[PDB]
Design a protein around this ligand. Sequence first.
Ligand SMILES: Cc1cn([C@H]2C[C@H](OP(=O)(O)O)[C@@H](COP(=O)(O)O)O2)c(=O)[nH]c1=O
Ligand SMILES: [Ca+2]
Length: 125
Amino acid sequence: KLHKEPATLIKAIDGDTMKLMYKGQPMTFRLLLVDTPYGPEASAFFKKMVENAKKIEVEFDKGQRTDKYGRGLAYIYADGKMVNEALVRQGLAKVAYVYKPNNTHEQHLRKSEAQAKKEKLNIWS
Ligand SMILES: Cc1cn([C@H]2C[C@H](OP(=O)(O)O)[C@@H](COP(=O)(O)O)O2)c(=O)[nH]c1=O
Ligand SMILES: [Ca+2]
């Protein structure tokens, strides 16, 4: 089963990438299963969500934990709320980069995207 692990925000980079302190080492992390462009709006939403959180958690999927750029690949939670899902639910990201076997939350995210699109939010306006 997947599990959540603590981490610390060092810096928000853009809509879907961040620097975290993870087990005592600074690392770039990249959100699984999403692509953010509405570029500046996606960056702003991500930054506010992670900076305001009191607790950040990393949840790796069941395959590779890093990409070819050395970035951690994870579902990131801000006070227990998944940031990847929050961005898609606002129409500030699309479900993208789906690489098996790291696809555990794909259906969940796809349903959020469908809602954003049905509500004509942001990218879908
Ligand atoms: C989200 C994700 C991206 N990537 C790669 C695909 C893209 O490669 P290329 O750079 O070769 O196109 C790149 C896009 O990331 P960004 O959207 O941060 O630029 O990161 C993965 O390998 N695994 C992943 O889970
Ligand atoms: Ca991107």
